[PDB]
Structure formats: structure tokens, C-alpha cells
Amino acid sequence: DRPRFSFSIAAREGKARTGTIEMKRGVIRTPAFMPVGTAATVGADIILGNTYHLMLRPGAERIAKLGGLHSFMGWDRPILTDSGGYQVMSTKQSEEGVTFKSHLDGSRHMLSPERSIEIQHLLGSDIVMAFDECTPYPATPSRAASSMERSMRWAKRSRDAFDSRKEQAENAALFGIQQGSVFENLRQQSADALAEIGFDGYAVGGLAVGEGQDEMFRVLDFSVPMLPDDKPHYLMGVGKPDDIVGAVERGIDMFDCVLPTRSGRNGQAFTWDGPINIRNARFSEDLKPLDSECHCAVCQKWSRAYIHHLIRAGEILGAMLMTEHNIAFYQQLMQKIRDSISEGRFSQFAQDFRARYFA
Amino acid sequence: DRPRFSFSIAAREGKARTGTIEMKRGVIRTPAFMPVGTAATVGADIILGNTYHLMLRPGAERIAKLGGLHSFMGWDRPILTDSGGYQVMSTKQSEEGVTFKSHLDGSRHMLSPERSIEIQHLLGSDIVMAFDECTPYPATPSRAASSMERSMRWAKRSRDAFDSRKEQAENAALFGIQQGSVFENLRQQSADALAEIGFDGYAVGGLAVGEGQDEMFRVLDFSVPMLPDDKPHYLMGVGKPDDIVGAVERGIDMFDCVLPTRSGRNGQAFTWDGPINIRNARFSEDLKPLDSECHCAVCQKWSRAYIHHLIRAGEILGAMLMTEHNIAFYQQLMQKIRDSISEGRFSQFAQDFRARYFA
Ligand SMILES: CNc1nc2cc3c(=O)[nH]c(N)nc3c(CCc3ccccc3)c2[nH]1
Ligand SMILES: CNc1nc2cc3c(=O)[nH]c(N)nc3c(CCc3ccccc3)c2[nH]1
Ligand SMILES: [Zn+2]
Ligand SMILES: [Zn+2]
Known about the structure:
Two copies of one chain form a homodimer.
Chain A: E1 6-13, E2 16-23, E3 26-30, E4 32-33, E5 47-49, H1 51-56, H2 60-65, H3 69-73, E6 79-81, H4 85-89, E7 92-94, E8 97-101, E9 108-111, H5 113-123, E10 127-129, H6 141-164, H7 166-171, E11 173-178, H8 184-197, E12 201-204, H9 213-223, E13 233-235, H10 241-249, E14 254-255, H11 259-266, E15 268-269, E16 276-277, H12 297-301, H13 304-312, H14 316-342, H15 346-357
Parallel strand pairs in A: 4-14, 5-6, 6-10, 10-11, 11-12, 12-13, 13-14
Antiparallel strand pairs in A: 1-2, 2-3, 7-8, 8-9, 15-16
Helix pairs in contact in A: 5-6, 6-8, 10-15, 11-14, 13-14, 14-15
The structure holds the ligand CNc1nc2cc3c(=O)[nH]c(N)nc3c(CCc3ccccc3)c2[nH]1 (2 copies) and zinc ion (2 copies).
């Protein structure tokens, strides 16, 4: 029987790590990419639930009545859920939480650390995020400090709420979220507060909110070493393939991004030679698959020309084939990352990846 | 090696028949439903190409440059194409053909019997439809007669154009299309003209254009017996499951309809208990699959509640799962039809089907 939660590091190269998270519902290979579960018939080891949407439609109590997200979505492996506040802010804030009104039916909703944990419990997720405040970018030092300090109080409330629910405490895991904007001293205080509380994993919050890759990497350079080395590191909201590679070089183990899902519906396909917009007329007679090396089912069977045709014709099949390819590309990227760290050649992989991806 | 075209009738019950069309690319079991090939990753024995759309994007010459529709769409089994005029009328008409302008780029296009056959040749279709005029409904006797007479002249031109192209004549089949609106005497003249020309199969044209099921069936009652018994009978544009059952009772062997494709994107799912609109709130907590007996992959894994959720959330996955189910439902319907004719119990099947479908 697998444990509730165990993270093992099998190999290291610089700050990069590869290993496994064992949970009751499955093993997660790291570095991991975690796709949205509603994106397609989803290989990923864990998928994301969208807490904010699920609160509003059909509601967390209704999901629980239907047997929880695993049964609802037909996915028996781990699920990670966010705590809902980031999405809410993307409103009246107070030390208690956030109040907001639903655009879909006008109903009022409150979100607090306690309610966020209870919603995630009702959804049945395996990895639960603490309820935090994602600080807007840019932030002054004072506002970033005040926000981070509030998040750390909410992290302790999240911990206590999680521990009070026996089924959750015994079967799920709880991640704390570091805040502090781009300021080293605040990132350090945040890390210190989270480690004193104690969590199963640690997320780097407050990034991928408009700062750009150079600044994000600069913050990761000093922020990730502040987190406990022996626990997983999740960079929330990241990202594009080059963002992922650079974040892994800086010690990140887990990733989520809307790019592959959103990109696919808007016509963007990821390839080892960079992204392409398949709607462009230059693909109307291109018989190559979306990517020349990709092993996914789309690239085994259909050409750029056909997928171009489908999307231009407004056919749903075109978007689904694009999304399937993008999700498969990301998983192939993560597998090459894991293999290269385990083989001690990740630095070369990253250099080779960037030379081709940006050519 | 399979023949270019061979239709064999294995069993009969009343006017209903079941059998097989053998073609070089595959065997088609009849009665057959022929789905749109761009609907999903499509079990069907033959799919439809959309001549009218393909003329306009990317163009028939471009499809031929890309290797033909089979290579383009990744489908190595038979493909049927329409002749393009029905779609064009859904314009300046003359004895030569029809002229029309493209909404997508303003280019002018002419469609004649000769050009329609050449386009279908460039597309590489296995079953080629003669170029006809679909008479609007209602039509006066005079207009219906004039239109049918023109269609019969165009049918002879279609035959000659097809026979002039050796690769087409030796590897594809040509169907003639009966017209004559709702008038028995015109349907008879049309049948007589088509049989004197000689075709591989015979379509009943000019129906499913607003007349309603009672009138359609009334026209089929006298029209299908006019066609050669030993060749397949294709009812163009039909239809809903109850339309198909009644048409098979009247001697039809082949079907096409946009319902399963269109219905799926608009929220309509076909079941043995009738159609349902999955977007309806009554399905928000319904844990049953879309249909209780359906063997398709969707109904093996996911609930009405989940598919409801996906469609309401605007997720592409929801429409694709609906479309996959609908196509699978139609193929299960055709298989039950074929089995019941072959077992001599189709009349009972039709009665049982209608009692449950309309309950
Ligand atoms: C696109 N950029 C982006 N930056 C983020 C920062 C934070 C942050 O500081 N705190 C929290 N809690 N979430 C964040 C998220 C949302 C991630 C998510 C949403 C849905 C499902 C699973 C995971 C972010 N996303
Ligand atoms: C929905 N009702 C409907 N009634 C039709 C009547 C005719 C008719 O009298 N003549 C021709 N040639 N086509 C017809 C069609 C289009 C069928 C089609 C389109 C695309 C691909 C494959 C097949 C019809 N469709
Ligand atoms: Zn691919
Ligand atoms: Zn089904």
C-alpha cells in the first residue's frame, strides 16, 4: 500500500532534481507537468481541478454528492486543486477571507482558509493548496510585506483546517505557498513561516503574473533554495516550455499552465522548433506532422495541412487534435527532462533545447 | 482483390434489405450510416467528404496535390462525396450548370456536371454522386418536371464525364439521383431515365428539404420500388433515427445526416429513449451514462452529469464526447437494423424501437 505522501529524490544535477511522489492513488514522476483535467481525455500522473469554477458550477457540495471529482471526471489517479483565491481575484478582502458575487447566478460566496480547505475536501482532491493571497505585480515593499504576512496567517489557518478533517489529513497532502513578490527578504520570511508550520510540499506563489522571464528567474534563483530541499517545489502558473526548463534548472519539481490548453484552441502548437500558429496559411500544404519527433497519436496520423484545414473550417476536431498534441508534447518534454537529470546530462539538454527552440 | 463495386443482398424482410457493397478500399455493410469524416476521429465503413466546402477551402486541385482525401484525412476506407450543387443552392442557373461567388475570398466558381465529376475525381472519392438539381419544396408540377428533366440531362453528362476518366471509371462508382419532388409520375420518369443511363447505385434526391416525415414516407412508398432492386438505394439527407427506421422499411440502404454532428455541438444526445438535451439542468446530477445500453467509450466511462458540466462550462471536450456518443449510437442503430433484417425480425424491431423512442 502506497503512503499518503512520500517524496523521494533519485538524481540531482546542480539545483535540478528528478524523483517521485508516492500517494495513495498513484506515483507522480518529477519534474511533473499537471494538465487541466477537463482539457481532453487525459501520460500525465496527476491532473488539476479548477476549484474556482467548481465552486460556482455545480458547487462543491454537489460534486461531493456525485461522489467527488475522481468519480465525476473518471480519473482515479491524483488530483491537485488550487485554493480558489487567486482565481477569485482574477471582491471585498479582509483578514477573514474574501467575499465575491457569482456572475453566473448572482449568488454570494465567501472564501476563507477554512472554507477553501472544506471545498477542496468536498471535491476530494489529493493535493490541497493552502489559501493564500497572490500579491499583484508590481507591488511596493510595504504592500508585498502586508500581503505576505496575511498569507502566512492564512497558511496556519489552512493547516489547522486540514488537520481537523480526519479523512483529509489521512489521505490527502497540503502544500504551503510562498509569497513576498520579488523581494528576497520577504521571500525568506515567508519560507521561514511556512517551514515552521510544516507542509508536505511548498509552492512558489506570486509569479507568472506579468513580471517576465528574466525577473521570474531572478526571484527563483534566491527563492527556491529557501524552501525545504527534501520536499517538492511547485511553481504556480508556469509555463511555456522554456520557462519550465529554466525553472527546473532552479530546483522546481511541479508545473501547471493554461498555455497548452488555451494555445490549442487559439491555433498554437508547441514543437521542438518553437511554437507555430497552425492557422497560418504557410501550413495549408505542409504534409509534415505538427512536430517531426513527437510520438503522439496526432503526429502519427495527421498532417499540419489537415489540422490547419480543420481549425480554419471551425471544426471542433481540429482544436481537440491540437490540444491532444500540446498535452503530449509537454509530457514528452517532462520525460526528456527527467531522463536527462537522471543521466547527468540535463545541462546539455537545456542548452540544446534552447538552441533549437529559439532558432 | 475486391471488385470496383459489387452489391450483394444477403437477407430481405418486406421491402427491407441487408447486405454488402464491396469496393476496392473496403466492404460497406447495409443498411449503412455514413458520418461526416471531419466530425471526429472515426465503426463506420464509409465516410462523407464535403465537396462544396472542399472546393472553397483548400480547393480540389490543392487536395489532389496533397494526395487526395484519403491521405489528407487519414482514412483508407471508402469515401462518398456529393456533387456540390445542393450545397451551392443552400447563384445563376443555366443548362450549363451553376455559377456562384465564394463568401471566403470572392473568387468565382462554376459547377457543371463535367466540373463536378472532375472535382470529385481530384478529391479521390470512391462513391461519386451525379451532378443534379435538388428541387425546392414545395414545387409545382411544372417546375418539378422542368427541374427533374434538367437533372436527367445532367445525369447523362455526369455519366459521360465519369467514364472518360480511366482511373475514376476503373476504381470509383457513380450514383444517379432521382428527382421529381413529391409527384409519382415525375419520380417514375426520373427512375426510368436513370436506369436507361445505368449507374452503380441510385439515390433518392429532393427529400429532407422541409416536407415532414409523413410526406417523405409517402413519396418513398412509391419512389423506391421504381429504382433497380439489385442496386443500392441512398436517401440523401436522412436523417433522425425514426426517419432511418421507416426509410429502411421502405427499401433504403444508405443514409447521411448532419443531426449527429450538429446535434452534438448544440447539446442534443440520441438515446434509445429518444433525444435528450444534455444542457438541461435535469441532467446536472444524473449519474447514468448518456444511454443505458450504449456500448460506446463515452457511456463506459462518463456520466450525463459530467458531460452536462463540460458543455455548460464551454469545454470542447464536452462537444467531442457528445459527438462521439452520437456517431456510436447511430452505428449501433444500423447494426441492430442489419441484425434484425438478417434474423427476420425487423418488423418487430421497428415496432419496439418506436414504442420506446417515442415514450
Ligand atoms: C498563470 N499564472 C499564475 N500565477 C499564479 C500564482 C498563484 C498563487 O500565488 N497562488 C495560488 N493559490 N494560485 C496561483 C495560480 C493559480 C494556479 C492554479 C490554478 C488552478 C488550478 C491549479 C493551480 C497562479 N497562476
Ligand atoms: C439535409 N437534407 C438533404 N436533402 C438532400 C437532397 C440532396 C439532393 O437532392 N441532391 C444532392 N446532390 N444532395 C442532396 C443532399 C446533400 C447530401 C450530401 C451532402 C454532403 C455530403 C454528402 C451528401 C441533401 N440533404
Ligand atoms: Zn504530436
Ligand atoms: Zn454512448
